[PDB]
Design a protein around this ligand. Structure first.
Ligand code: 3DW
Length: 264
C-alpha cells in the first residue's frame, strides 16, 4: 500500500500564533489529517515536545517536514472540532457531559505533568473532540518542561490567555507549573457549566474576581452552577497556589465521583 503520505487540502480548521491549521486528505489510504502550516519567514520546540507525547487524551503527532521557509506539522484530525463550540453561550452544557469532558481533561493533564510537561494555555479552543467525543489536548506552542531528571524548575514567563491564567502568574516573579494548569482547568469547567467566563483576569483591579474572593456566589456565573461542582470550583479557584487543590485530590472530589452519565 504505497503513496500513504500524499495529502489533498480541503478546509481551514483554525489559526494559531505561529500559523494556520488545514484539513488534509490522503491519497491511497484515504486518511484525514490536520496539518499546521507556519511561515517561519518556537515551532522547533513545539515539534520537540510533540515527539514526547503519546496518550489517548493528547492530539497525536505524526511528523514534520520543512520546505525552506514553511514548516509543516502533521497531526491527528479531530472531527468533533473544539470544545469551545460545544459550550452554549450563557448556558454551558449538560452537567453529565461537562463531567465526562473534565474527567478526560484531567487524564490528559495528569499524563503531561507526569512526563514533566506543562501546557500553559489550556482553554476550550485548545481542547478538541474526536469522532467519539473523546477530548484531546492540542496546541503545544506555549508548552515547556518543568521537571527534568526528577528536579522541578520554577517558571517565570508570563504567558497563556488572561481569562484562563492563574493569579500568581500576574502577581509573583516565579511560580510552580502544575497549579497554573489546574487553575485553567477550573476556568474551563466554569465555562462548561455556565457558558460564560467569570472574569477578564484574576487581578485585584477586576471586580468580578474581587466578588469571587468575597464569596458572592449569588452572582453569575456561580448562581448557574449546582452546589456539588461549585464546591469543586471553590477548591480549584483558590488564589494561593500552594493551598490550591492538586489533581490527586480533585480525583477524590464528591462531584468528580458523582454517578451522572450512562454509558454508550
Ligand atoms: C464552525 N467550525 C466548526 C469546526 N471547527 C473546527 C474543526 C476542526 C478543528 C481541528 C481538528 N483537528 C485538529 N487537530 C489539531 C492538531 N493541532 C492543532 C493545533 O492548533 O496545534 C489543531 C488541531 C485541530 C483542529 C478545529 C475547529 C471550526 C469552527
Amino acid at each position: 500500500v504505497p503513496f500513504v503520505e500524499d495529502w489533498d487540502l480541503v478546509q481551514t480548521l483554525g489559526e494559531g500564533a505561529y500559523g494556520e491549521v488545514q484539513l488534509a486528505v490522503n491519497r491511497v489510504t484515504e486518511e484525514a489529517v490536520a496539518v499546521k502550516i507556519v511561515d517561519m519567514k518556537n515551532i522547533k520546540k513545539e515539534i520537540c515536545i510533540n515527539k514526547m507525547l503519546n496518550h489517548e487524551n493528547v492530539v497525536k503527532f505524526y511528523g514534520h517536514r520543512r520546505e525552506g521557509n514553511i514548516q509543516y506539522l502533521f497531526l491527528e484530525y479531530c472531527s468533533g472540532g473544539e470544545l469551545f463550540d460545544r459550550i452554549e453561550p450563557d448556558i454551558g452544557m449538560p452537567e453529565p457531559d461537562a463531567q465526562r469532558f473534565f474527567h478526560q481533561l484531567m487524564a490528559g493533564v495528569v499524563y503531561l505533568h507526569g512526563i514533566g510537561i506543562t501546557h500553559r494555555d489550556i482553554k476550550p479552543e485548545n481542547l478538541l473532540l474526536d469522532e467519539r467525543d473523546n477530548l484531546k489536548i492540542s496546541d503545544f506552542g506555549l508548552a515547556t518542561v518543568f521537571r527534568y531528571n526528577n528536579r522541578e524548575r520554577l517558571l517565570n514567563k508570563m504567558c497563556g490567555t488572561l481569562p484562563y491564567v492563574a493569579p500568581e502568574l500576574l502577581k509573583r516573579r516565579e511560580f510552580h507549573a502544575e497549579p497554573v494548569d489546574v487553575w485553567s482547568c477550573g476556568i474551563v469547567l466554569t465555562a462548561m457549566l455556565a457558558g460564560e467566563l467569570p472574569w477578564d483576569q484574576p487581578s485585584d483591579s477586576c471586580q468580578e474576581y474581587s466578588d469571587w474572593k468575597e464569596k458572592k456566589t449569588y452572582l453569575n456565573p456561580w448562581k448557574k452552577i449546582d452546589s456539588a461542582p461549585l464546591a469543586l470550583l471553590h477548591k480549584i479557584l483558590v488564589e494561593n497556589p500552594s493551598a490550591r487543590i492538586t489533581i490527586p485530590d480533585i480525583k477524590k472530589d464528591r462531584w468528580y465521583n458523582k454517578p451522572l452519565k450512562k454509558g454508550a
